[PDB]
Amino acid sequence: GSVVIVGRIILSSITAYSQQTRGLLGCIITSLTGRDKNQVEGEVQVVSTATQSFLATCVNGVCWTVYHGAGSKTLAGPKGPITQMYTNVDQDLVGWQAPPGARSLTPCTCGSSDLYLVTRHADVIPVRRRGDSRGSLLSPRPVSYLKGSSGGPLLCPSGHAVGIFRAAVCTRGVAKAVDFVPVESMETTMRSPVFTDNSSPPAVPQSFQVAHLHAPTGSGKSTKVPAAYAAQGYKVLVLNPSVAATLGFGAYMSKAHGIDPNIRTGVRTITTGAPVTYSTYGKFLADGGCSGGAYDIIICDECHSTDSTTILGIGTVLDQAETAGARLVVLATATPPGSVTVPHPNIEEVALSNTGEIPFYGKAIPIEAIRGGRHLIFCHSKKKCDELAAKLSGLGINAVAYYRGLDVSVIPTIGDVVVVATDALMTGYTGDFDSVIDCNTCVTQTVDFSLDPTFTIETTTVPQDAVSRSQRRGRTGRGRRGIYRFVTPGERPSGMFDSSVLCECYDAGCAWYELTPAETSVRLRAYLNTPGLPVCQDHLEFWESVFTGLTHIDAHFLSQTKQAGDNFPYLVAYQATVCARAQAPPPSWDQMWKCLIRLKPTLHGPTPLLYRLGAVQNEVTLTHPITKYIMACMSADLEVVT
Amino acid sequence: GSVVIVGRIILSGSGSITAYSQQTRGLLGCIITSLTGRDKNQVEGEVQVVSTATQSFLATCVNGVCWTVYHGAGSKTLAGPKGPITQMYTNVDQDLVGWQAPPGARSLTPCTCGSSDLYLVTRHADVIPVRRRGDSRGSLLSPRPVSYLKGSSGGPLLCPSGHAVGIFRAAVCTRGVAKAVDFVPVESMETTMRSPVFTDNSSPPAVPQSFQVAHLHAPTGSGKSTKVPAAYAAQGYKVLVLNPSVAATLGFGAYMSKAHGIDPNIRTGVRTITTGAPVTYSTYGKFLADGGCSGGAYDIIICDECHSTDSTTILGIGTVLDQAETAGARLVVLATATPPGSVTVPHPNIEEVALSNTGEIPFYGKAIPIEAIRGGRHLIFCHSKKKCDELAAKLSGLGINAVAYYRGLDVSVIPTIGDVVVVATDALMTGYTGDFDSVIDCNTCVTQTVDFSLDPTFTIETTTVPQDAVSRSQRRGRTGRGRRGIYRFVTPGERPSGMFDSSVLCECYDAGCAWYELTPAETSVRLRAYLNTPGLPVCQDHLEFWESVFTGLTHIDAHFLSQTKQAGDNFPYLVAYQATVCARAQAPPPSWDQMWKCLIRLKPTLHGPTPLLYRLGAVQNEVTLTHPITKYIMACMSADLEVVT
Numbered sequence A: 001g002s003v004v005i006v007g008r009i010i011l012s013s014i015t016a017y018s019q020q021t022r023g024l025l026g027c028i029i030t031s032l033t034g035r036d037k038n039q040v041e042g043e044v045q046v047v048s049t050a051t052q053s054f055l056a057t058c059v060n061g062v063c064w065t066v067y068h069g070a071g072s073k074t075l076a077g078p079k080g081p082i083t084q085m086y087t088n089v090d091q092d093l094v095g096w097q098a099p100p101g102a103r104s105l106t107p108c109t110c111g112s113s114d115l116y117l118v119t120r121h122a123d124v125i126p127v128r129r130r131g132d133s134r135g136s137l138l139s140p141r142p143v144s145y146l147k148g149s150s151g152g153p154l155l156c157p158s159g160h161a162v163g164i165f166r167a168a169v170c171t172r173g174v175a176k177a178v179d180f181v182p183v184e185s186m187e188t189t190m191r192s193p194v195f196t197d198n199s200s201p202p203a204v205p206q207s208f209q210v211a212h213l214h215a216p217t218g219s220g221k222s223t224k225v226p227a228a229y230a231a232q233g234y235k236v237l238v239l240n241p242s243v244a245a246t247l248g249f250g251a252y253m254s255k256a257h258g259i260d261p262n263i264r265t266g267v268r269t270i271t272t273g274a275p276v277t278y279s280t281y282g283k284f285l286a287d288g289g290c291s292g293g294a295y296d297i298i299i300c301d302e303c304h305s306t307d308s309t310t311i312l313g314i315g316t317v318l319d320q321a322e323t324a325g326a327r328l329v330v331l332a333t334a335t336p337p338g339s340v341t342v343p344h345p346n347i348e349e350v351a352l353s354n355t356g357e358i359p360f361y362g363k364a365i366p367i368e369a370i371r372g373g374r375h376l377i378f379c380h381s382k383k384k385c386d387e388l389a390a391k392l393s394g395l396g397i398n399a400v401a402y403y404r405g406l407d408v409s410v411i412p413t414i415g416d417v418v419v420v421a422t423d424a425l426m427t428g429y430t431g432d433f434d435s436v437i438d439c440n441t442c443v444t445q446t447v448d449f450s451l452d453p454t455f456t457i458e459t460t461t462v463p464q465d466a467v468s469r470s471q472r473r474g475r476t477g478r479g480r481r482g483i484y485r486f487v488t489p490g491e492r493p494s495g496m497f498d499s500s501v502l503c504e505c506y507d508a509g510c511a512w513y514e515l516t517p518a519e520t521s522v523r524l525r526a527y528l529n530t531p532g533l534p535v536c537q538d539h540l541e542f543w544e545s546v547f548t549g550l551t552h553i554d555a556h557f558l559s560q561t562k563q564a565g566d567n568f569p570y571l572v573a574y575q576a577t578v579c580a581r582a583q584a585p586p587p588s589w590d591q592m593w594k595c596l597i598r599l600k601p602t603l604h605g606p607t608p609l610l611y612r613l614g615a616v617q618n619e620v621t622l623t624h625p626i627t628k629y630i631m632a633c634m635s636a637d638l639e640v641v642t
Numbered sequence B: 001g002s003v004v005i006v007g008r009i010i011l012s013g014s015g016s017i018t019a020y021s022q023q024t025r026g027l028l029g030c031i032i033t034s035l036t037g038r039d040k041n042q043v044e045g046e047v048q049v050v051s052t053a054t055q056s057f058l059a060t061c062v063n064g065v066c067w068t069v070y071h072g073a074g075s076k077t078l079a080g081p082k083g084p085i086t087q088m089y090t091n092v093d094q095d096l097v098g099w100q101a102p103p104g105a106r107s108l109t110p111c112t113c114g115s116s117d118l119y120l121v122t123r124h125a126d127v128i129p130v131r132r133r134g135d136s137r138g139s140l141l142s143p144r145p146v147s148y149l150k151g152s153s154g155g156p157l158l159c160p161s162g163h164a165v166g167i168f169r170a171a172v173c174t175r176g177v178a179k180a181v182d183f184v185p186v187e188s189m190e191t192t193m194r195s196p197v198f199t200d201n202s203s204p205p206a207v208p209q210s211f212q213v214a215h216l217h218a219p220t221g222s223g224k225s226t227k228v229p230a231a232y233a234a235q236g237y238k239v240l241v242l243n244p245s246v247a248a249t250l251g252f253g254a255y256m257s258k259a260h261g262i263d264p265n266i267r268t269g270v271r272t273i274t275t276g277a278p279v280t281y282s283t284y285g286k287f288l289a290d291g292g293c294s295g296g297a298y299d300i301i302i303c304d305e306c307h308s309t310d311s312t313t314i315l316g317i318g319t320v321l322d323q324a325e326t327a328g329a330r331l332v333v334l335a336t337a338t339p340p341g342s343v344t345v346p347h348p349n350i351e352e353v354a355l356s357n358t359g360e361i362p363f364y365g366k367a368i369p370i371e372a373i374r375g376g377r378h379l380i381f382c383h384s385k386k387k388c389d390e391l392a393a394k395l396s397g398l399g400i401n402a403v404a405y406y407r408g409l410d411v412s413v414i415p416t417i418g419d420v421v422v423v424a425t426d427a428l429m430t431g432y433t434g435d436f437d438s439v440i441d442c443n444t445c446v447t448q449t450v451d452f453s454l455d456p457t458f459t460i461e462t463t464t465v466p467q468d469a470v471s472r473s474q475r476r477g478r479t480g481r482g483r484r485g486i487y488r489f490v491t492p493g494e495r496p497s498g499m500f501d502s503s504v505l506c507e508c509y510d511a512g513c514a515w516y517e518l519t520p521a522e523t524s525v526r527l528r529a530y531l532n533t534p535g536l537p538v539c540q541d542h543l544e545f546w547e548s549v550f551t552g553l554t555h556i557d558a559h560f561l562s563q564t565k566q567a568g569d570n571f572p573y574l575v576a577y578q579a580t581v582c583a584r585a586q587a588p589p590p591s592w593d594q595m596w597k598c599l600i601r602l603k604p605t606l607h608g609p610t611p612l613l614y615r616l617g618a619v620q621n622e623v624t625l626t627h628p629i630t631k632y633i634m635a636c637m638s639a640d641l642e643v644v645t
Ligand SMILES: [NH3+]Cc1ccc(F)c(Oc2ccccc2)c1F
Pocket: A067, A068, A089, A090, A091, A092, A093, A496, A497, A498, A499, A535, A536, A537, A538, A641
């Protein structure tokens, strides 16, 4: 779908009023066609996608809005879809060349500290400028009131544009300040070159530099380029999220490039003294990050990946590498932030219909599409994997399920098979397939700052983003012909991750890598501050405050949550620690809380709830001082997008 | 818009019950099929996945009828092969509607044997074991978040033979966890199949020999409040007429003496008159303040405008329904032009014209041409007072006679007589009885809804929502009275009529406590009579919950309560009660919004975090949760709460 103009805010002192120009049906047809004949007028547009409505503001002949609303989408235009002229994911800023008829605001330069924010309800809200990109509301309002207003102008009294609104700063759901993209960032973006070529490895610089390498899988980002560097006499570390891919690089390299590299993973280490080392991000973190003078070049491969080990690994590199004597860090991915899935030569893409013997996510799979050959079917949950595999096996098709917890040996690796897998496949198994069939959805975790009493981690099923779609499809068509079948043609924008992932980073720092919350913060700050990487709201101080209060955890409970391998071993174990010590029961008797089972007869009373990691069946008390501490942590400034 | 079928849930034909789904329409397809109401896709399976523009849920064909829930479908038609299919059954009280299924469509059939082992089919195609625990209730073997059940209303509960026990309508929840489920029994459906499709309630009922409650559905202007009590009086009966509005009540009284030659008793705050006549006109509030039905005083009680879901009306009607028989009445008449399930249809005196973007006057994203409102007497409905003020300000600026009216202002600021554009909120309909050359409708309304948010307790949220069919009809009814009228609108709206939020129940306990000296127990008896009486607006049954809350709210400060009563804002009891706990802890109110004005004089001595009882608006101050009343209300949140799915 395209972004589509559905109304405008007419500006006049400053006053405004709105016009709606399209209803639902109009919006939807126009999004699918990309063809908008409606005459555009004014400098502020009300825009919508399928899921969301926000604002857009024309300045210097460019219609600007936020990446978090528009992603990389085209804008429906008089002659068809308009592709973005500017995309700056770090600044949360995108722009399309303004269509004919649209007026621009003029940048504000004299620079008043009295500002006026124009919202989607056509209210004009006074704001006191506090920085380059920040202003305080004279009257604090519920954030709910500012939602849908992303992309709207902050104006000085003369009606010139200071910037566009991107986020609210909140104390317990009440917005006290606003963050905006300043016009100077728009000017810097306009002056940058549209096409910057990152497809080729950079030469080693004289002094330290961080570079980006955007190149497809099979381009030898992880083999040919490290070989070339070693041949120039450098020492090179290559980090990858997958154990299977890390181990695989070693056999390929001693064969294809005459180097027997060091290999470091949790399951297996090999030290040959060679000048190339392959390691997982997790093992790299276990080994204590950069060792002084060990490496000249560090390649962080699959740097689009937003699991917490990778982010924490990369932040460690970015924080430590210069000081450890490295001259070059290379951030490598085939799918950088803001990338979109485009046709691939090796891969025929065919929509699933309703005809076929096998139900699948509301559509169907013909038995003939998978009867012989080697096929991969991506499902969102292990439950779906188990059931679809059982169904296929019942029909005599050789089928197997793979997901977190199973050994990859369930394979086969040779011969006819249908593999039914979650995304755990990506990191567990490196092979390719004749076809990939994709449900186009993913399970994710999102934090809800629900104040009941503290926060909640919610597990939801969502539409896949463009990284997911590209990585799942990329399991077919590798140096041979392939087919990608799909349920849905969409893809969410890439390059963004939820605050829950930050929480997971602190959790893993504490649970696995012996990192203080303060140390985790230094490493994440380096990640956040480095451009060209996936982006997130800055909740570092908040999450640091939370974990900082979680002292004297019970080692035994932690070992058991770590061992059982579920998602926030430290939060889980810590809640179990305070339950045991308070001599009180867990929030429920779900599997999550099994580490308390032997104390179940001597439990009793309401649970001293710290936070919500699932359904809470038992009664709760809010009297525990850790609860009160975490409650106090909720008063921190929290960036929230509008 | 019609409801449209967008998929289906296919059940296993033998062995264990299992299921899977098939999606038959995307978004665009759904939206288009909604507009035309024309759906050529044939209807396989017995469980359909249905959608409106706003939501999706299920519908289960049993015995040639495609059944679903009123809270999902309202009174809407179902997109069909020859165009929209009108509902054949609409039972608001059971939350059950039915459309005749297209010929050839597959249909489940009823549970002949009678198992206590049940299986609920969800929109996800899961089959969830349920233990039957009554005629319309069953326990979940494995408790689940209620979020997992949403979108599943209208789906079947099956017995082991795959035969239908009933359709899912609501979950019973403890702090967001569903432990049980409510369904419409297949027996409630088989009645409706066998019974008459049409009812006529257009004539006033004959006085029966023994107590009965009857409905009168007839237009404004058929004399529901004048002609019919007069006709009853003419047959020797004593009649009490209840109405929500003082102005309407006084207006009827006066008309009766001038037209039908009776000088009736009149009972209102501003004017009370006893003549000994056999007709009496009262507001519901005065009737409540009088202490309800007095023994032997009336044969007939007309509860007029019985579609109203303000708390005074609900509590008033509930009192009549609980007391009237024992007080000797023979007949209660529940009277409205717009009963639950009603829909706006064309009116002959009224030309209805959509606003466009053409016009000098911005109006809710559209525009009003000046020429439409310069010549004559005109009524513009706005959702809020701010907007009424900003629009009047603009209109006078452009040289028009424009006045604003909303709660807090005095009527008669409206010329009589003169020649005018009045810009008003819904308060107009109870403050002023006149009609107009045209009505201009924003088609939206301010409403309050309760969120059981556990942060720490509940929240009453003020929102702006699309209007319902009662609102549309009532706003449109202010033109085309006896003559030609013009109705201009922003949207062709109508959410479904006859449902009210749990916050209104809260308001009834609040009003019992604040105005009418009703203990929560006593309020519950009256409310129970209203909910148990069919054909009235309906709500989820949270009576025990709300009773429990108010029962603990004792020793309020009488001074603060008298100030919130007088100021006329919503929830005077809960506002005064929060202020009471603040003042006694020397703590500030949650904010310094006007809601908290009773505490302004004390601001210099108020310090620290507010002991927060509940959320009635934005909370700006820091909060503490240690107050014993906070804890008591927290404990009330463990109650079983009906929540629609
Ligand atoms: N300030 C950094 C930043 C940059 C770009 C974004 F789109 C963005 O917005 C989101 C929103 C939700 C999740 C992740 C990122 C953001 F915060």
